[PDB]
Amino acid sequence: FRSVISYKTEEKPIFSLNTVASADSMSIYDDIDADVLQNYQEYNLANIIYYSLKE
Amino acid sequence: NLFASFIAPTILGLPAAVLIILFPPLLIPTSKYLINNRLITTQQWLIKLTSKQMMTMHNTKGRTWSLMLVSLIIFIATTNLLGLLPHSFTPTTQLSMNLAMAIPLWAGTVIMGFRSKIKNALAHFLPQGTPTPLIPMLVIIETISLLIQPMALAVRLTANITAGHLLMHLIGSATLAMSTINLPSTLIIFTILILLTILEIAVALIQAYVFTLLVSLYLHDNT
Amino acid sequence: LQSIIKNIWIPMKPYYTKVYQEIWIGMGLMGFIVYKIRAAD
Amino acid sequence: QMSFTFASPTQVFFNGANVRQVDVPTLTGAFGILAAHVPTLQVLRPGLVVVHAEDGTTSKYFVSSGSIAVNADSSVQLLAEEAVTLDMLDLGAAKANLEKAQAELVGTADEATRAEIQIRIEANEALVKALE
Amino acid sequence: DIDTAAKFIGAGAATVGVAGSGAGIGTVFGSLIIGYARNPSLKQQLFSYAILGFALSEAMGLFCLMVAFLILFAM
Amino acid sequence: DIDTAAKFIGAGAATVGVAGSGAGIGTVFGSLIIGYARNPSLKQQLFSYAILGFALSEAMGLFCLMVAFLILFAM
Amino acid sequence: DIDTAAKFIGAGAATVGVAGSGAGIGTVFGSLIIGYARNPSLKQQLFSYAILGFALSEAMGLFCLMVAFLILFAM
Amino acid sequence: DIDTAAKFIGAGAATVGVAGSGAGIGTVFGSLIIGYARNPSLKQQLFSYAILGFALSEAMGLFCLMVAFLILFAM
Amino acid sequence: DIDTAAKFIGAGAATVGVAGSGAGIGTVFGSLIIGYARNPSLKQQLFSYAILGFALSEAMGLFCLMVAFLILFAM
Amino acid sequence: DIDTAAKFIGAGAATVGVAGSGAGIGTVFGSLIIGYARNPSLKQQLFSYAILGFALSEAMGLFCLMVAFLILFAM
Amino acid sequence: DIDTAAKFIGAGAATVGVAGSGAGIGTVFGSLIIGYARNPSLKQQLFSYAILGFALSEAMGLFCLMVAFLILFAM
């Protein structure tokens, strides 16, 4: 939603456990294993669905 | 007097140690059938589990020792378990048998590593990213390690099994010496003896597995 | 000589001749060590 | 240096706020986040979130679950599915529901149903411990 | 004469062995601190375990002292 | 004379060896506190593992009391 | 004259057993540092637990020291 | 003739006990490293605790040295 | 004579107390490894602490060596 | 002779200082395992540290062995 | 007549130093357990490190035993 007159069809990406676990930029996030990343990815799926619905 | 159970047994003047060392394989009957009795079924399940445990980490050349390493673990485990029965003579308490088990296998692995693999065999004495001013020292260490591996194998078996047996015998004496005295204390010592017996069963199996696993790792470092 | 090497040496030939050669060298080494131990005793 | 965004799906508590310490009940333990805290990302369990303002004052909330992300730029993002100020809950209902959940646990015989009962039990235990 | 002297030396050697109980109690209470900082809601049960730890480790140390005194006075 | 003296000294030195059992018990129960604060639902399995570790440390102490008594009595 | 020599050597041995309390206090306060770095809002209770653990470890160390002083002066 | 010899042996045995403070200081500063790598904003208070821990662990060591210098010189 | 004999024995005993320095150095550098793996951005400062920790624990060991050379070569 | 006897005993005593380096190498390599499980992308840097830590801990141990020889052969 | 006695005592003292390798191997394999429970995807490399650590830590112990034999049998 942009304005009362304007809206734009947007697209957002959804990553898997293997994408965020295998990333080299995630090596700086401490106290992380596959279980916390699984929980985090599930919750973020719910969050992105909610945000899309509200837009 | 105290080490009487580790002296080469003799019956009527003959070396009964020969029979005691040849007996363990008699407890493993084999069959050509497809569906056979409970003993062979359980034993074949155990042998398959043991082979998959010991041998999956090896390449095609280290997997030619499947027969050797499975035979080693079966033989040692059955000898250690049969050594727990009353009055028995355990041949794995002898430094001679354990040296004759340890030196051939370790020497075979290191000679296999020096025949082929010779570049990597000589490179193994130095870890990959070792800093420069320390390269000499870490070669004096690793080298002597490779030279104590056989002895530290045999002793680790001998010194363990022997010790276990000794402990049990001593606790046994305790119970006997306490049989004519307070009986609740005798029962407490007997419960300690039962816990020690279960621990000795576990240690029999664990020592078989660890001897075989160290031989397996020496083989893996040379194939 | 018969039915022994048919049930003992034909099955164990691939291992005694090919696989355990280094084991045989090491067993010679072990015998040498045991001879040096028993002789200095 | 710490920019703290604390939000619920329907309500924003902090938005880029400059707090100095936040205590969160992560599923791998509780911890307190200050500026330059090591980057981490965790999911929450029911419990109190105590936000410490630069001027010593603290705000206590009760979050049911959600996520927490401490980033390399000292930016913290706390997102709770159900965040509630402590004055909106009552002790009696927490205790009654905890008792009901304990009873339904001692009754249930399934494994996943029992898992759900245990989740409800521990949630109500956190509620009881947090209220008083 | 020499027997009493060796009794003194042996009691000293035997009471060397309370170092293990000292280190073990240190470890038990350090881990209590750590595990309570992580899960401060288990404060009770955690402490129980700590108690149990301090009851077992110290026991070993006490054993040493017993032996020491048994060498010094009784036998 | 000197033999009983050395027996007392050796008994003390041998009972020094259970300091390691005390320290190992401390380590086992501290790690039990930590692991239970981590996953408080595995209380039974964690306690059983702690009992096993304690038993094995006590066995390593028994191996020292064995030599203590082999010095003191059965020279 | 051998008793005084034995008392000296036995007191040195006895006071060896303080290394355990040294290492245990080191462990207690290192774990205090770690547990305070994780949860800096439990500082007072973490310090209470640290005081308790240090007190018990120092108690074992002082038991060793007092056995040493008992041998050295009061026989 | 034997008193001075026993004094040397007891002084060595007593100064053995500094190993405990060495290990405890190692633990304290390793924990400082870890707890600071976690939450560096506490770097002051963390370090404070370290000092305290240090000054206590080393304290035990000094006791040992004290007994050494009490055996070697004051007697 | 007996006094130089005891000097040798006491120097060896005093030298035993370098084990604590070895263990503490191991702990300091292991915790440096762990804390650098966790927060590699703090590396420099972490290394600083490691140095400090190292320089302190070794120092204790040095005292031990000192006492050794105080017995074997000085007094 | 009594001086050579004490040379033997003093070398045997001074050799105990290698326990510290053994435990320290154990700690350094356990912490290498943990730090590599945490951040496997620093396997080089970590390992460097590891060897450094080893090189230092064993260093202290070597001193003890060296000292032992310098009581057995030098004087 | 007396030098063989000192050889026995020095060999026992020198072999005391294997406690460090016992503890170091304990630390290495405990940290292998922990680091593999954290990242079971590196099970091979982790295990490799363990072996290395073990083979180095145990090395020091053999050093001690070496000296023990070099006091008991050679000179």
Place this chain on the structure above:
Amino acid sequence: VAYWRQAGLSYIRYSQICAKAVRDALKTEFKANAEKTSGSNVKIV
């Protein structure tokens, strides 16, 4: 790995149970609006 994940659940179900439990413990002055705001209405096809 928590007990509920071993039992096959997910963090979405965990969150659902925990949020419902936090809602049930609300004093009735807020409870109706709370259960209206967060109630699900979508149905699966």
